[PDB]
Amino acid sequence: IIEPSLRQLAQKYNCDKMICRKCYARLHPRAVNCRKKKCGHTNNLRPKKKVK
Amino acid sequence: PNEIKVVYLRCTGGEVGATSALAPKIGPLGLSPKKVGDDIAKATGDWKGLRITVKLTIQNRQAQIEVVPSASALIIKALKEITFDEIVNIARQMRHRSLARELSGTIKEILGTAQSVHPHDIIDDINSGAVECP
Amino acid sequence: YQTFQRIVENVNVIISTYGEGESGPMGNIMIDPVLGTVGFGSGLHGWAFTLKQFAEMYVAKFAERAKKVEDMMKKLWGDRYFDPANGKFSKSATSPEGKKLPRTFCQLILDPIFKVFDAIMNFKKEETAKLIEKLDIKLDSEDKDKEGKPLLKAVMRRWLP
Amino acid sequence: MKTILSNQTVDIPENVDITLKGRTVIVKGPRGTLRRDFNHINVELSLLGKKKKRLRVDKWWGNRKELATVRTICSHVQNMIKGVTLGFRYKMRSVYAHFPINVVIQENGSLVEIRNFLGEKYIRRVRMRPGVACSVSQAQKDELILEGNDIELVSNSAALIQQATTVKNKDIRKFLDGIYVSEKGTVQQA
Amino acid sequence: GRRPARCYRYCKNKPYPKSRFCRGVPDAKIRIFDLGRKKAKVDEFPLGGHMVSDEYEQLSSEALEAARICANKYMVKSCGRDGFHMRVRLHPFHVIRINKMLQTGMRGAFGKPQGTVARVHIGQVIMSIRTKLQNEEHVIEALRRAKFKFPGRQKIHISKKWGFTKFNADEFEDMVAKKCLIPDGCGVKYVPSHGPLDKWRVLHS
Amino acid sequence: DRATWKSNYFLKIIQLLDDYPKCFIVGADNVGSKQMQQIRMSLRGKAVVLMGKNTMMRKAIRGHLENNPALEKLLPHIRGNVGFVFTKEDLTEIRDMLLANKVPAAARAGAIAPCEVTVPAQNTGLGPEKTSFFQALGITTKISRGTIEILSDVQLIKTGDKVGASEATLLNMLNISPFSFGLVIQQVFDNGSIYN
RNA sequence: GACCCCAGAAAAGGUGUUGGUUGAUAUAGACAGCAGGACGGUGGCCAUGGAAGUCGGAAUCCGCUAAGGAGUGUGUAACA
Ligand SMILES: [Mg+2]
Ligand SMILES: [Mg+2]
Ligand SMILES: [Mg+2]
Numbered sequence A: 001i002i003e004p005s006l007r008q009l010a011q012k013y014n015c016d017k018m019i020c021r022k023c024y025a026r027l028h029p030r031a032v033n034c035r036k037k038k039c040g041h042t043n044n045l046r047p048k049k050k051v052k
Numbered sequence B: 001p002n003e004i005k006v007v008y009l010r011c012t013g014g015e016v017g018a019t020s021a022l023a024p025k026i027g028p029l030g031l032s033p034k035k036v037g038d039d040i041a042k043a044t045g046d047w048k049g050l051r052i053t054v055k056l057t058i059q060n061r062q063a064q065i066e067v068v069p070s071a072s073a074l075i076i077k078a079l080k081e082i083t084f085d086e087i088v089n090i091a092r093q094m095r096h097r098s099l100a101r102e103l104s105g106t107i108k109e110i111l112g113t114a115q116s117v118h119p120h121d122i123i124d125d126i127n128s129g130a131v132e133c134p
Numbered sequence C: 001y002q003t004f005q006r007i008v009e010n011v012n013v014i015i016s017t018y019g020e021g022e023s024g025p026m027g028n029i030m031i032d033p034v035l036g037t038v039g040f041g042s043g044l045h046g047w048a049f050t051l052k053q054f055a056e057m058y059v060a061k062f063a064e065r066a067k068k069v070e071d072m073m074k075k076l077w078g079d080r081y082f083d084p085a086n087g088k089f090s091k092s093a094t095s096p097e098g099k100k101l102p103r104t105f106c107q108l109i110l111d112p113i114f115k116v117f118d119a120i121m122n123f124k125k126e127e128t129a130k131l132i133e134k135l136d137i138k139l140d141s142e143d144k145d146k147e148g149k150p151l152l153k154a155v156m157r158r159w160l161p
Numbered sequence D: 001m002k003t004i005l006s007n008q009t010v011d012i013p014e015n016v017d018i019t020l021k022g023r024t025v026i027v028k029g030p031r032g033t034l035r036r037d038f039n040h041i042n043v044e045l046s047l048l049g050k051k052k053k054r055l056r057v058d059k060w061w062g063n064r065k066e067l068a069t070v071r072t073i074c075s076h077v078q079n080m081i082k083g084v085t086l087g088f089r090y091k092m093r094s095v096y097a098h099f100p101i102n103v104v105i106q107e108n109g110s111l112v113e114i115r116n117f118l119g120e121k122y123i124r125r126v127r128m129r130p131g132v133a134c135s136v137s138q139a140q141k142d143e144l145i146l147e148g149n150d151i152e153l154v155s156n157s158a159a160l161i162q163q164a165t166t167v168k169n170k171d172i173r174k175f176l177d178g179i180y181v182s183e184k185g186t187v188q189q190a
Numbered sequence E: 001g002r003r004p005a006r007c008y009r010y011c012k013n014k015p016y017p018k019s020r021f022c023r024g025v026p027d028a029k030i031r032i033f034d035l036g037r038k039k040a041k042v043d044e045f046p047l048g049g050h051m052v053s054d055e056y057e058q059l060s061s062e063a064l065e066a067a068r069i070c071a072n073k074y075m076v077k078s079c080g081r082d083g084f085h086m087r088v089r090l091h092p093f094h095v096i097r098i099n100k101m102l103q104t105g106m107r108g109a110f111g112k113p114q115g116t117v118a119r120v121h122i123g124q125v126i127m128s129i130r131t132k133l134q135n136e137e138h139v140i141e142a143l144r145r146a147k148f149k150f151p152g153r154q155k156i157h158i159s160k161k162w163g164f165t166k167f168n169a170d171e172f173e174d175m176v177a178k179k180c181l182i183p184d185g186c187g188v189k190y191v192p193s194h195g196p197l198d199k200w201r202v203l204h205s
Numbered sequence F: 001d002r003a004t005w006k007s008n009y010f011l012k013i014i015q016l017l018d019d020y021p022k023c024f025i026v027g028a029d030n031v032g033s034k035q036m037q038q039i040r041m042s043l044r045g046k047a048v049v050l051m052g053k054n055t056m057m058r059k060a061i062r063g064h065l066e067n068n069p070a071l072e073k074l075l076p077h078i079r080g081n082v083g084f085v086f087t088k089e090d091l092t093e094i095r096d097m098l099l100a101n102k103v104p105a106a107a108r109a110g111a112i113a114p115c116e117v118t119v120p121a122q123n124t125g126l127g128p129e130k131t132s133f134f135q136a137l138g139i140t141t142k143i144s145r146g147t148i149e150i151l152s153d154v155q156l157i158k159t160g161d162k163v164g165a166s167e168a169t170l171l172n173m174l175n176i177s178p179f180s181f182g183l184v185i186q187q188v189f190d191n192g193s194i195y196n
Numbered sequence G: 001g002a003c004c005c006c007a008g009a010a011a012a013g014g015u016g017u018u019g020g021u022u023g024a025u026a027u028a029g030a031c032a033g034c035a036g037g038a039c040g041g042u043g044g045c046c047a048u049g050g051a052a053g054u055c056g057g058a059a060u061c062c063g064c065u066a067a068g069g070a071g072u073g074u075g076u077a078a079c080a
């Protein structure tokens, strides 16, 4: 029974992030290029999907 | 407050509709007109547009009296049975009349533009009649 | 208390939407704790109670009996704030001293229940003895040697059948 | 391209005394002493004024990579000033769906025990960084206050708590249990 | 079914066109070389963009078909089916042989025709797209996508010539005005100032 | 077109500054486009209102300053979201008609509330399906006469603090009047004079 | 990473850094941040079970304006 104010706080760290298409790394939502060496810092990113 | 809050709008028109539309869906708000009320409301609202025909209604504890706003497509299709500037010129007299205007001549420009559903070229370099309407 | 009221509200809106009017042939059907048509407890542990018991025993602490318990249940449940320091019910959550007043339901129904739960679950033997003596609880033999949640079941089963 | 000079200046408040022992900055203020040496960066640190008390960081012939260390040093020094003047208070709101999280503060707020995270029997034990104090709130229901002077240590303690409270083998988008840093601010709010 | 393109990437053989000495060649993959509004006049599309190859290599007919379709889908989706014209200026006139192993060995190793490739040189245009001026971005993107179906490296050039013709865009207007060119079809007819005077009488009248 | 539009703004401002000797500088608060439409139509009889970049205003003013000096008084006052209203009617009547047309602005979610609003305990008239919002905000409410009914008056938001989405949508659904405000006169300018 | 033969590599990527080309915005106030607005005819026409800017086929206008698209997205069954 999570109150919405805490739901936003939890989602900020858990859900609302970006994912590299090549290496699945969890990046900050405003990231343009991946931060990890094994994916060539590729700029192919997709938002982490929601639960709805 | 007229014993009821019936200032809601309805978007039924043309065919009867009745219970096929959302007339019974919004009916329990007042519960008074019901299946007689939507029948007579459609009987009055058959004309003034065979389209969706958005309108407002006023309740007298049993029945409904309808006012039909001058929607663009509504009045255009209703007047339809070419530029026909004369008929829009006379049709801007009874208009809603605000249109966020500064002059009345701009109103016929705006609706000769919205009637594009070409008559844009008269509105583009109109020079006659911008004073004629008021 | 807030969760209890949430459940009450949800049931009430269910029956309001999907039932007939208050003027209906059935009549008023919305359940109110002041009407004593909602109860509490736990069936697994064998104890339960309503608004009637606490009000009745507090009236006996303080024909005519029915009137007293009936109009006392209205103070028993609601957004009414009772000060234990004052000893009189108040309808303001702020005292003249400015101190917040716990509401009556939590103050004189939930407070003893919470206190007996904490004493039994944390094994405070003198606390449970004092609580039994204040609440005139009659335990039986073979219940006087147990502790923890079975002792909780025993005390609650005897106190609130 | 070696830029001839890149310099940045930080103003010191009146009630703060900053001493330079080489590249080791010692910031002293009402809340105590913060010490940090920047010996891994080759810069020219100097104290200029007598009433303003400006501190200048200079980097000569810096290429692109090391040109960014000047602002890093200035921001770290400003963090030291903030810590010794107003202190750092991180408020963490412990959020749980079903199982309440029992947070027990042990000796002088240096140890935090998370008991019932997701209703399990293992007790997480987290030791705060030295000089960092933990507290359980009074104005808030499920809130932890982390106070300190070194922002590095305070936020690292907060991250220690947050990453101790971690869900495994589950849809983390669903299971939102844990303690998260609701806000980052100061003491005395000055 | 078809051998990888890297086997026939290089012009390692003399030209082998489908002739009376090379009979039974299977038909190539690409059949339509002009798409879009082929009928548009020269003045309709004043922009020409070319995909100039950098490798003296061989481009398979299947690859040409795939790149043509890749350009066609994007150009239709971006500029509509009436706003561009595509001309693939390579034809697969070279036949590549294959020595299938089921006599056995390298004895009688000469191979039967398998497919057709087009030999292209450095600086040679593979594809040309003519269009309206403001669609330069769309043309460059379309040719950029089409590059991915070819082995070697290709460059996108915004040609100075008006459309598909052989005259510069800045001189095209006054050349037509002073009648050195008459438009017809997608191109123009250059009118030299020598010949019969009756042609000049047909002009200026 | 940007250069032409800026030029058009220059000619517009110089023409209206020459035309109207009486102009009031007015601060635009969190005022909406619909509010501005209403204000322009209300003042369509007598006044005309212009707003734009302060830097553009000041630059055009300084450019026209040789032609009309004493307009430099307005120069160190073109700050923040403000603008000109040109009028020829008297000071207190224009001020009266500007304070008269202040729309009852709805509580926009995420904004700061300047007013302290406490909702009463009345027959709301809402259907018994909006009760979930009353449960989310933390109001205990009961069904009376087949409609939502609040037992006690309750404050919702203090002054000078942020508003929440649920708190705002509840007030929108109740259709009560939240904090209301509009464009307010900063100063006046009467033919080379400055007043408060 | 480290020298003809030569003992090992490709297409394709990089907001790592450097150099170069072309174009653009800007003291009439760039850019990025924080903060406002983001309207009316019009809940535009067909399309339908509901598609009100945002499933689609077409159109791309007007006035208020400082600006607001009959719409770049998220979202609703549609709204919001
Ligand atoms: Mg900073
Ligand atoms: Mg699993
Ligand atoms: Mg050979």
Ligand SMILES: [Zn+2]
Pocket (backbone or CB within 6 Å): A020, A021, A022, A023, A024, A025, A034, A035, A036, A039, A041, A042
């Ligand atoms: Zn990656």
